[PDB]
Paper text:
By comparison to the oseltamivir inhibitor constant (KI) of wild type NA, the KI of the I223R mutant increased 48 times and the I223R/H275Y double mutant KI more than 7500 times. The change in the KI for I223R (48-fold) was largely accounted for by an increased dissociation rate constant for the enzyme-inhibitor complex (15-fold) rather than by a reduced association rate constant (kon) (3-fold). In the I223R neuraminidase, this pocket is occupied by the side chain of R223. In displacing the two water molecules seen in the wild-type structure, the arginine makes a hydrogen bond with the side chain of serine 247 (S247). As a result, the side chain of S247 adopts a different rotamer and is oriented towards the active site which enables it to make a second hydrogen bond with glutamic acid 277 (E277). These changes in the structure of the I223R neuraminidase result in shrinkage at the edge of the active site pocket that accommodates the hydrophobic pentoxyl group of oseltamivir. Thus, oseltamivir binding to the active site of I223R neuraminidase requires the reorientation of the S247 and R223 side chains. Moreover, the reorientation of the side-chain of E277, which is required for oseltamivir binding to wild-type neuraminidase, is presumably made even less energetically favorable in the I223R mutant by the need to disrupt the hydrogen bond between S247 and E277. Thus the binding of oseltamivir to the active site of the I223R mutant results not only in changes in the conformation of the side chain of S247 but also in the side-chain of R223 being translated about 1.1 Å out of the active site compared to the mutant ligand-free structure. S247 therefore plays an important role in the decreased sensitivity of the I223R neuraminidase to inhibitors.
Author numbering:
A (entry chain A), B (entry chain A), C (entry chain A), D (entry chain A): 83 to 469
């Protein structure tokens, strides 16, 4: 039966660790895919990890030059959550250097973008069958979430971007049914910039927290209903959510220009005027990670907060992060549970290796007792392939 | 329920990438079978990759001398599409140095030919159980499609060849039910030559596009109904489909003798007088690949064409190619969707290695937007086993 | 349907070997997790091996320093009984450096403790979904069974410990339903010490045999009904069950202070006044293993016994051991069958390696003929990674 | 539903190759168990390969000394037919240095013998649960078929041997239901010798062809009904079936003393007075293999034969062989199909290696066309571990 998506987010006081795959550590010997931009999504029966391979294994020569973002060798694959991404335990989804996926309760929808930078095509699959395609409309690296799409009442929603990553671009919202695009709309967002949206369902509507790679060290957001009637803005909190960023101070309801160039995929959960902010501990690089509750951070520019939970140490590598949800249909609860994953990036450019890859950790929001700590990657680089 | 096979091919304007396994790249470290002549076929529930192993893994000593076509060690195995062919994820089908397979909607039929060059026997299995055999009738390398057989209304059809590969030979059409041969007929084709047929269902009849290894740089074809009442001919288009071949010029409805010796397994899709032609970019070797639409190419000798889509670069290795279909029972469409796979051959004879193997890519025909590009093998030879 | 748990233990005259995975031997080449504290538990359909990984594979550099008990890299995983614990065949359960698991007949309950030594949190999962958490209440290494929890009539029971491991600590009994804690009680046990309880169901009540790490070379026990109304004591037999211990002599119904410091996880089965005692053959180190029937050993201090069966040779490595049961729902018997597993520890601290790991053997209680022998680990250390 | 076992063997004119796993070749790099005495057995849904591991992988140090027959490390495992026996694809059955297995249509029965030479115990499992045990009654290497047991009308039958392997011993027939021994009888066979019986069902009765290791270069046989009312004898044919043996001449209905010491596990199929004989091509060592039809060979001493089919070349390694059947319930036929497997032994004692292991091939009896050939192991010894 199709996910209803009409309940609100569950109240959350803390985050319980959900999984950790130790990919890099194990790939030191085992047969583990070189990967990046992993993410988690759940069917009514299980939770899977999606990832973009580089068509190579760790500690092999073909892992060389994997700093590179796009190529014909990259593919979208998935394995069970907490398991290592291996050729022996991973299912093939699509050929892609950018992707999204989500389960509407009936079947898996996957979105895989491949092809040249000036004419990339997104292939939509429903239950493993090609159901639709969309070609670049600006001919400049058509790209998408790199996390799960959001499903409500039999429809799945995603956001896509085409154009410059350092200037005004084009952003479109899609409504998809049975892997078929049934409605789309371009966002009227002059001076905004959207990348790698983390979108989730909440009371029959979708909320996306994204990445301003242009000129915003705070995060941009889009919320829309099933008819794609949307609203835009930036998270107001003085607790800046992007990386790099400036030290915490007074925030803005518009793009915070200071340290606003570049960025990293992230997320956040809106509760009334309050916000759950996941972010790196460092303001300059992709190190550490922490969850921060600002009861007034969604609409207020104050730099205060009530709660702060450690996820990854300040001196440890982190990277991308994104949201995923567990619907009532899966949990048996009467509300949509917020979860999140973190990508722990190892290798280039920060380390002396020929390769770049990441492992993952994940947490779920609970109202019972929790605790901070540091669950880092834990691999020792360089590897033998790098010597 | 059994596939009806009575709808016509879906109209197709372009080809969307469906899968890529990156076998050679991964086999550089992982435990991946040395293989060749792979192909794809679909049950009403999934799509699998079939392949002939050499009973050896890449980057191992036993991969040595794998240039050789036939031997007792070769076996027919299958794994899920897009996955690497590994001993840890592959299912054993049959002992074979030549094979075909297809699902009639109820169960898998596999055809595996093994034994000596002068008395090979084809073993038919239905749902993994031996249901029939056929021995060589000309005692000269009994061989078959190396791609999926075609199923219609509970019957599966294949084509087999016995005799010289550089002169007139013998070609038979078979009708098979529950893995049991219920009717066969010899093709009356003096001056024709058939090898490695790519056959597909279309409106209750079967169409096969094959390989004239004798004296034809254009492709031969056979079409028959369920009672094995057939027609033969050659694709007329001046867009020659085999390799090697001459530069494009005026074609023929008979075998184009020029550069007609040798060849490579290929395919094509007939739409009225028009044809979808898949072929290498090079006219001399197995490099590149492209899809070309000639609205008059099936029955006309003109060397014109409306559409051309790049699949593999001119300077990249290709190889065999073949068709497969997804029936309405699988897709939910009201027509039979045309798909195709390409074998990317690496190693001998063109490269300095002790071994020969291939990886695969696949596409499906869509009417939505698509794009050309190059999705090559991407491995760096020689391997460590070759040093 | 939920396990009834109301039948009594089956009479048992001997122990039949049930499984052996040969993990270390195979991990010498294969991709096998470095593990410790493994244990077995059964659903109404199968029996699985649970284990705590160190996030590393044998014969790899990351296996280094695995003597260490707790860290963020450790995870709870499971595979089918008798199979090697591998990334390619193991299912991920939870992030944990201490754990318990058990099936109530409907779904799997897993308990994974992670976090810092001064604030560890136990995460309860039911069917893979987080259902509850418990934080350390003494802020000193919250820890649990390291073996299966006990289920009766739809409720699962475990025992947890927080505080010193060399002095008085705090011990709590939990009642859990659908992975949700519905009742708990602190044990009033001054001068007792409980660690790593081996608990089993018997006639609608739970019996736990544990490890006094403080001052008892005989084993402590807890028995309670569904309402958590409990009794405590120590096994009286002069056949001391812990390691290290003194030579057999007159026992005590209280902690035997002599050689009472430290210990090792163990178990025992109560039959009236009699006891089935599993223990190391050595009184000083973790070598050998034997099953001993003392018809008066539960309540009597005599050092006599009727039956003695060899499991592991005196000069062979052993380690932890624990009980598991097979309910009538699984076996078809009208009684709860007692089984047990043994952890064969290799590496540090007793051997010259950088790593520490264990393999496992298991037996089931039968009333038919059996025999003693020695089923040791059988690996040759050091490994190549240690050179 | 339970196998009826009441139809007769299907008429067979030849043997079609069914599978080949290429284990040794692949284990040169892959993670493949060192094994010996493999065998095949079928459930109503699939056919599996059973084998005794040595608790080690090929090309690893622990494979050393695997010439040895019995040890605590050996285990009974199974994987799908034609697949390599790997820790990543094999299911654990039982701890054993001798075994049998068979499916009664409802569940798998496995028999695993382990323990010391002077008190071995056979553990019977039904659907993975221990259901019974039998201890050595002569205290001299209790051993069994090393091939599938035979099932008829809900009962499974096996033969076991205890005592000298070079003199008179003790042989018992067992009737087993739900893994529980319900009847047994000792064979009154003075001057006979039985080892490693290949037993099959035929018209509600069981026929076993075995190995006289004492003083018979022709094969001994036992046939019994469900009540264990039996008959004994030796295959009369002058086509001697054991190895070693003398050149073919006039046979005997008693043990052929000439070259009668030692032997090798084999099989044969009785059709009236005629016999299908599988045997090595060499009379002195375990090389080659061939199927021979002697229409009068069961009861006649003539050294004539009608049909001879090559399976393995004279100069290629062979080894054990055994029968297995596919019941009507599996095939849909109205008769029990005879199949057979061959073990291709590599390594010690005949080759310069530290290890010993085997791969397998299998065939099924058909009435359609077949052909002889040689499907050998195909590995190049020694391996790197042997250097
Ligand atoms: C093309 C712009 C885009 C967003 C800024 O770049 C991303 C940033 C990179 C990064 O900041 O880590 C990694 C992503 N793989 C890349 N996405 C693609 C499709 O290349
Ligand atoms: C026997 C003739 C046949 C068709 C020309 O050869 C094929 C060509 C070879 C090729 O051109 O690549 C490879 C095929 N493996 C081979 N088929 C067999 C059965 O050996
Ligand atoms: C923290 C005390 C506890 C019980 C004595 O230590 C155990 C003993 C160790 C041992 O004696 O082998 C190994 C266990 N992994 C360890 N448990 C934890 C959680 O660290
Ligand atoms: C114990 C006698 C027995 C039959 C002759 O030996 C067999 C012969 C050996 C052989 O001839 O190859 C291998 C078998 N693994 C062995 N069986 C056992 C249980 O050790
Ligand atoms: C939070 C919410 O709206 N829950 C609704 C519930 O009220 C309603 O009964 C059901 C449809 O019947 O869908 C769900
Ligand atoms: C590490 C490795 O695989 N080797 C090569 C390296 O020698 C070369 O300089 C580089 C060029 O791109 O690519 C890589
Ligand atoms: C909460 C909600 O949107 N309910 C919808 C209903 O409005 C819609 O008409 C129907 C179409 O299938 O699906 C359901
Ligand atoms: C293209 C085509 O012939 N489609 C047919 C449909 O008309 C028919 O109803 C059905 C059998 O009832 O089989 C299918
Ligand atoms: C690369 C390898 O495996 N080694 C051998 C090579 O030395 C030998 O000359 C050849 C002969 O066929 O076969 C191979
Ligand atoms: C479209 C078509 O061929 N329909 C066939 C029918 O003609 C045939 O008699 C029957 C036999 O099973 O199967 C169906
Ligand atoms: C040992 C025992 O108490 N067995 C009981 C049985 O008597 C009872 O009939 C059943 C519930 O009806 O539960 C079980
Ligand atoms: C065996 C190995 O992996 N190497 C290192 C070793 O050189 C180092 O001294 C030690 C320090 O903790 O950790 C490990
Ligand atoms: C033997 C036993 O405890 N039976 C219980 C019953 O007492 C209890 O009221 C019920 C609640 O679900 O479950 C069952
Ligand atoms: C060969 C043989 O005996 N076949 C029998 C068949 O005659 C009988 O009808 C059935 C039981 O009804 O069992 C089977
Ligand atoms: C090949 C190998 O693993 N090494 C040893 C070898 O050095 C030793 O002499 C032998 C003794 O049994 O066992 C093995
Ligand atoms: C052919 C045959 O033996 N049929 C048997 C029948 O004789 C027996 O009484 C029954 C017991 O379950 O099972 C069936
Ligand atoms: Ca930014
Ligand atoms: Ca040609
Ligand atoms: Ca103690
Ligand atoms: Ca003999």
């Amino acid at each position: 039966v199709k996910l209803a998506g009409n309940s609100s987010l569950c109240p959350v006081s803390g985050w319980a660790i959900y999984s950790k795959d130790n990919s890099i550590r194990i790939g030191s010997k085992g047969d583990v895919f070189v990967i990046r931009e992993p993410f988690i999504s759940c069917s009514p029966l299980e939770c899977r990890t999606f990832f973009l391979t580089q068509g190579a294994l760790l500690n092999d020569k073909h892992s060389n030059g994997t700093i590179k973002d796009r190529s014909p060798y990259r593919t979208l694959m998935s394995c069970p959550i907490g398991e290592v991404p291996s050729p022996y335990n991973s299912r093939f989804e699509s050929v892609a250097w950018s992707a999204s996926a989500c389960h509407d309760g009936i079947n898996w929808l996957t979105i895989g973008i491949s092809g040249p930078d000036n004419g990339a095509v997104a292939v939509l699959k429903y239950n493993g069958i090609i159901t639709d395609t969309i070609k670049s409309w600006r001919n400049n690296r058509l790209r998408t979430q790199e996390s799960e799409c959001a499903c409500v009442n039999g429809s799945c929603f995603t956001v896509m971007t085409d154009g410059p990553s350092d200037g005004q671009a084009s952003y479109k919202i899609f409504r998809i049914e049975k892997g078929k695009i049934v409605k789309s709309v371009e966002m009227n967002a002059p001076n905004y910039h959207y990348e790698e949206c983390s979108c989730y369902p909440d009371s029959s509507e979708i909320t996306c927290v994204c990445r301003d790679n242009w000129h915003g060290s705070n995060r941009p957001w889009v919320s829309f209903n099933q008819n794609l009637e949307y609203q835009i803005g930036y998270i107001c909190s003085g607790i800046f959510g992007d990386n790099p960023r400036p030290n915490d101070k007074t925030g803005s309801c518009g793009p915070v220009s200071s340290n606003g160039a570049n960025g990293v995929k992230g997320f956040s959960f809106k509760y009334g005027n309050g916000v759950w902010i996941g972010r790196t501990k460092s303001i300059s690089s992709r190190n550490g990670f922490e969850m921060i509750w600002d009861p007034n951070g969604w609409t207020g520019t104050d730099n205060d907060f009530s709660i702060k939970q450690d996820i990854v140490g300040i001196n440890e590598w982190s990277g991308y992060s994104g949201s995923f949800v567990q619907h009532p249909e899966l949990t048996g609860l009467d509300c949509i549970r917020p979860c999140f994953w973190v990508e722990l990036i190892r290798g280039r450019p920060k380390e002396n290796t020929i390769w770049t890859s990441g492992s993952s950790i994940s947490f779920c929001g609970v109202n019972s007792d929790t605790v901070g700590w540091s669950w880092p990657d834990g691999a020792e680089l360089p590897f033998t392939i790098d010597k």
